[PDB]
Amino acid sequence: MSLLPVPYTEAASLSTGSTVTIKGRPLVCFLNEPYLQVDFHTEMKEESDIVFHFQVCFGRRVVMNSREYGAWKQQVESKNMPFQDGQEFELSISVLPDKYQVMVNGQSSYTFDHRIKPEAVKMVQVWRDISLTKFNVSYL
Amino acid sequence: MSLLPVPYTEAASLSTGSTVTIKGRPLVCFLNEPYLQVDFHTEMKEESDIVFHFQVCFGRRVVMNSREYGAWKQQVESKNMPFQDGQEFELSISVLPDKYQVMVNGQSSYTFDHRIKPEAVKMVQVWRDISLTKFNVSYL
Ligand SMILES: O[C@H]1[C@H](O)[C@@H](O)OC[C@H]1O
Ligand SMILES: O[C@H]1[C@H](O)[C@@H](O)OC[C@H]1O
Ligand SMILES: O[C@H]1[C@H](O)[C@@H](O)OC[C@H]1O
Ligand SMILES: O[C@H]1[C@H](O)[C@@H](O)OC[C@H]1O
């Protein structure tokens, strides 16, 4: 159904048991290396610190990081690529006690240990080379 | 004035003396590393070979390459960054006899020797994290 603005910004609160669910499509073929980025920010401003940075280079790699007092921290790299060329994906990011868990099409694909408590998050931005049909923050 | 679709695709022919002129703005602050990409393709299809690949990571670096029979060739990297944080840019790509010349805000900033004759180009795509107000192909 209806496309959401990209870049997509939504104010958010997270704690243990929160899930962020995203349904979108790469804009172009994996040969051309479209990106997806999801950032969990400490403020509504885009220049704010990032508790959780998730960046897919489709068909190549994922990197995850934090940006603390303006400075990028230790990059975590994954060559895990469950995303399918030309396909709609469903991404969900679960806040566990110790980490974020990233599910791609219902499959556990990436984890990232909390560097800052998730209660620090005030904003989620989803951006780069995707169309977006679904954004939802939810709780169990 | 009016924003052009991004990704932006236009059919094109190039030869010595052709210029491609682009006016756009990064979507977000340089702290967040927005990209710009301009690709000179051999066909209208996005998966086609790339005679000239120009990719800016704003505030960080530029890479240039070609993609020949589906395969990326020798990357050329430049740490030259004449683009200004939060500012509209004017990019023009001149086809010289031996190379493309890339002007940023009227300033010679990047060159790339022809690997394939520019007459091979049938399509120009401008994409990633920019808004676009101006796209023109012209000749002297
Ligand atoms: O994606 C981030 C990266 O994790 C960090 O290490 O460098 C700056 C950005 O490119
Ligand atoms: O493969 C995934 C795994 O499912 C998850 O549980 O941990 C991070 C990655 O290594
Ligand atoms: O930008 C290109 C790069 O020039 C080439 O070397 O690798 C694949 C892409 O990431
Ligand atoms: O600095 C630029 C120069 O203006 C141009 O002419 O060559 C490529 C780069 O090194």
Side-chain angles (χ1 to χ4, degrees):
Chain A
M1 55 183 281
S2 338
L3 287 214
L4 296 166
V6 178
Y8 183 79
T9 300
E10 196 180 290
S13 304
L14 307 176
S15 72
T16 307
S18 290
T19 300
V20 184
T21 304
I22 300 144
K23 197 140 117 167
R25 205 174 188 114
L27 287 176
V28 306
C29 67
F30 280 14
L31 191 61
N32 286 1
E33 302 194 351
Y35 286 70
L36 169 60
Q37 197 160 314
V38 177
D39 296 304
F40 296 177
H41 287 262
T42 62
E43 304 294 335
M44 284 299 297
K45 296 169 72 103
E46 286 160 352
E47 335 84 75
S48 60
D49 285 353
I50 297 179
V51 166
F52 182 44
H53 159 85
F54 179 79
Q55 182 187 83
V56 183
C57 186
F58 285 106
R60 286 282 258 91
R61 64 160 194 178
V62 178
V63 302
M64 296 172 278
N65 213 329
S66 58
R67 183 174 73 207
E68 306 179 19
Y69 310 94
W72 294 102
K73 287 304 216 190
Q74 185 69 186
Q75 178 165 274
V76 183
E77 194 173 48
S78 169
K79 302 311 277 265
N80 193 26
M81 191 52 55
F83 300 99
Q84 300 296 301
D85 198 2
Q87 303 311 130
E88 187 166 65
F89 61 81
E90 193 197 43
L91 189 78
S92 76
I93 301 150
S94 303
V95 180
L96 317 195
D98 276 353
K99 63 188 84 84
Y100 303 94
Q101 181 158 46
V102 182
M103 315 294 290
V104 182
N105 303 325
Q107 189 198 134
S108 175
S109 298
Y110 314 96
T111 65
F112 184 89
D113 284 11
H114 296 314
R115 286 175 194 181
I116 310 162
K117 55 154 215 296
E119 288 84 4
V121 173
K122 300 199 207 225
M123 182 267 269
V124 177
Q125 179 163 69
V126 182
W127 69 287
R128 306 200 186 265
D129 307 297
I130 63 142
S131 58
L132 212 73
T133 57
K134 212 182 284 274
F135 184 100
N136 206 265
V137 182
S138 67
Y139 188 89
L140 227 190
Chain B
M1 55 183 281
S2 338
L3 287 214
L4 296 166
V6 178
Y8 183 79
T9 300
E10 196 180 290
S13 304
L14 307 176
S15 72
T16 307
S18 290
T19 300
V20 184
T21 304
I22 300 144
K23 197 140 117 167
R25 205 174 188 114
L27 287 176
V28 306
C29 67
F30 280 14
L31 191 61
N32 286 1
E33 302 194 351
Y35 286 70
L36 169 60
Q37 197 160 314
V38 177
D39 296 304
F40 296 177
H41 287 262
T42 62
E43 304 294 335
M44 284 299 297
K45 296 169 72 103
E46 286 160 352
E47 335 84 75
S48 60
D49 285 353
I50 297 179
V51 166
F52 182 44
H53 159 85
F54 179 79
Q55 182 187 83
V56 183
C57 186
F58 285 106
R60 286 282 258 91
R61 64 160 194 178
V62 178
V63 302
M64 296 172 278
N65 213 329
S66 58
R67 183 174 73 207
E68 306 179 19
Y69 310 94
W72 294 102
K73 287 304 216 190
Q74 185 69 186
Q75 178 165 274
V76 183
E77 194 173 48
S78 169
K79 302 311 277 265
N80 193 26
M81 191 52 55
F83 300 99
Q84 300 296 301
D85 198 2
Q87 303 311 130
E88 187 166 65
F89 61 81
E90 193 197 43
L91 189 78
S92 76
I93 301 150
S94 303
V95 180
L96 317 195
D98 276 353
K99 63 188 84 84
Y100 303 94
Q101 181 158 46
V102 182
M103 315 294 290
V104 182
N105 303 325
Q107 189 198 134
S108 175
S109 298
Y110 314 96
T111 65
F112 184 89
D113 284 11
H114 296 314
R115 286 175 194 181
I116 310 162
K117 55 154 215 296
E119 288 84 4
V121 173
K122 300 199 207 225
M123 182 267 269
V124 177
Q125 179 163 69
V126 182
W127 69 287
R128 306 200 186 265
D129 307 297
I130 63 142
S131 58
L132 212 73
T133 57
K134 212 182 284 274
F135 184 100
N136 206 265
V137 182
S138 67
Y139 188 89
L140 227 190

